[model samples]
Target: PRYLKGWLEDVVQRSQRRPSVRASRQRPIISLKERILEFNKRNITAIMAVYKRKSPSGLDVERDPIEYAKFMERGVVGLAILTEEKYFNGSYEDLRKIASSVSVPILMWDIIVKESQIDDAYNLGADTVGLIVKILTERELESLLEYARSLGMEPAIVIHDENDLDIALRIGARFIIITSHDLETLEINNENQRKLISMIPSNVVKVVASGISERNEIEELYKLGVNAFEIGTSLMRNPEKIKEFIQ
Candidate 1:
């Protein structure tokens, strides 16, 4: 037990200090480029929503672990493991097992509103833990981020507007996700979103989370200089078609 504890602590320390490979260029940069390149280099495409329906969406994916393992072996590089069984549709145990079986990085995405959830995320094989700006105050957010850092879990904070970006920047978040669809039901055209994304600093990796579905949407987002697109619903609907667009 002592040896196992020591080994785990070492692993945590190393994860904390592991340098971020996201681009650190000047302003008006693209974050999705580096993410795609990372996946391409690893010969895998990224997919989220694997465990979401089971935990939070009130529906079960009936996602066979064997099938999921095989999928990862083929080309899926990353997964976003949801936490809330009632609202998200997946459990930490399932995600932990999947992470143990696969080489992909698991991003723990959910309403992580407490310090304990940060630890839970790390224990569940998450390289990154996500929090929403809508649910936390600045102080609460910063404290949570600090805890995640100490545990060697990367932080991916989501924001919907300039104000949220301000909060993310103030907290020194390197990985920021923008899902503007949460903020406005109105159709978010590319021209307007590009202008907003342009304001994001180059040192940060900007992931576009909401509204991306087909290959066409991703291509259009690429034209607008997005770094990563979260294509969960689309992928779940058409994994084959989506796979063709990842490269």
Candidate 2:
């Protein structure tokens, strides 16, 4: 849309004016693997998150999708679109609206239970798809991962616990994301995080998601060998803070 195009131009100009943005622009855009590798090479934790509608207290706090996408693209290696379409108040249209406008790759984060769901992710403008291992059978997960790869989309398996992590490894997942939504406060302690990270293979790209807020958390996660992080609520509240971690 014109709105997205306009904001994208504005972001481009701002990126040109900022030294940090210029450095980020130098990163490759050919694939999600390249972007994450760039983040690792720079020793900066990649941020992968996106949201235009949030409900912190049972009330929907809507944001302009274009603006949110632009803000995240400034410092994150990739952006995730929550297209769950139920409690998260997300939709496929939301992904379509902002996917092409940003320079970073777009990840479709949702309950991908079927092969067709993977197809929808590619057709709807996603460069990667998020798969929750707990929800899918071994055969389903393997099949979906293969399908996503066939369509030139990466599969980022979501791990919530040791079991999920083991399954991801068993399935030979290269990119894995850990979410703390099941935690008491949707957060994880550094000790627990270390334990989880220790289980992942050294070659795997491990990302922490949910309840990540301050720069300290990113630093701590990075120390534990986390390749990336995904933050939604905290980043949405203070998007400027993204610069602190990337710069």
Candidate 3:
């Protein structure tokens, strides 16, 4: 209930009412997928540090997201900043500050399944905007994916199962993010991960998100074909701890 309930009130309602951004996309947007691939060529840990002040569990990674993102730059490959205000306690101001502050590619990790948010993401200097398959229909997913690309930013999609993966793949997602948990229930399900990870085509940039906290786990996931990771909680507690996963 926390999932659908919060998304409906916090995201579905909020996205439409969110103001449109007029700041045009900077020429030649950086490809977050390509950048991760480039880092992969070196066999390094392609970690995307997520900056959030809070979550449903509450008070997570507390800090001025800008400085936190800056401090995390040397240890991570990219930045994923939360922009949803209700559930995540994040804002566009948080997005803009870190986007301008960081040298790494930025991922606006919000749940807005529409063009308005994507427009804001592009205009705010995001190299990549994020989507979750659960929140959109196949038609909405396809159209929004196309729309984001047309704006010069390629998008990344989050998938929870084989069905979601199918939708994401069918819609031509270049980056596929797999989380080892049910986002709705907030419970870990590593069993689903192996099968889902194996199903993706090798050409797609696969990223593992959430419930990861060890070097050996990253090693195992990398061995299973994931090229990048979207990590937060652990890194929030200690940014340098990621070096163990770094090549």
Candidates 2 and 3, the one with greater TM-score: 3
Q: Backbone collision count in every prediction? A: 13, 0, 0
Which lDDT values do the candidates have, in the order given? 0.59, 0.71, 0.81
Instruction: Please tell me which model should have the higher lDDT, number 1 or number 3.
Output: 3
| Candidate 2 per-residue lDDT over residues 165-229, each given as its tens digit | 88899988999888766523333544456788888988788888756777888887788788888
Query: What does candidate 1's lDDT look like per residue over 1-247, in tens digits?
Result: 0122332334334434433222221122122234455764565444343435542222345556535544744554456666444444456666666666666566766666677666666655567777777667798889888887776665778877778888899998887777755333334444446666787886776677664666676677666666666655445544565466565
Q: What is the Cα-based lDDT of residue 24 in candidate 2?
A: 13
For model 3 the local lDDT of residue 40 reads 87
- Where does candidate 2 clash, by residue pair? none
Q: In the order shown, what is each candidate's alpha-carbon RMSD?
A: 11.2, 11.5, 2.4
The runs of at least 3 residues in candidate 1 whose Cα sits more than 4 Å from the true structure, single-residue gaps closed, are 1-50, 54-61, 183-192
User: Roughly what TM-score does model 2 have, to 2 decimal places?
Assistant: 0.81
lDDT per residue for candidate 3 within 1-247, as digits (tens), equals 0135644546667776778765644444778899899888987779888888777655465677877887888878898998888878898888878877778888998886678888889888888887778888888888888898888777888898999999898888888889875655666777788899899997799999866789888888889888998887777677777777675
Question: Which of the two, 1 or 2, has more lDDT?
Answer: 2
* Highest lDDT scorer: 3
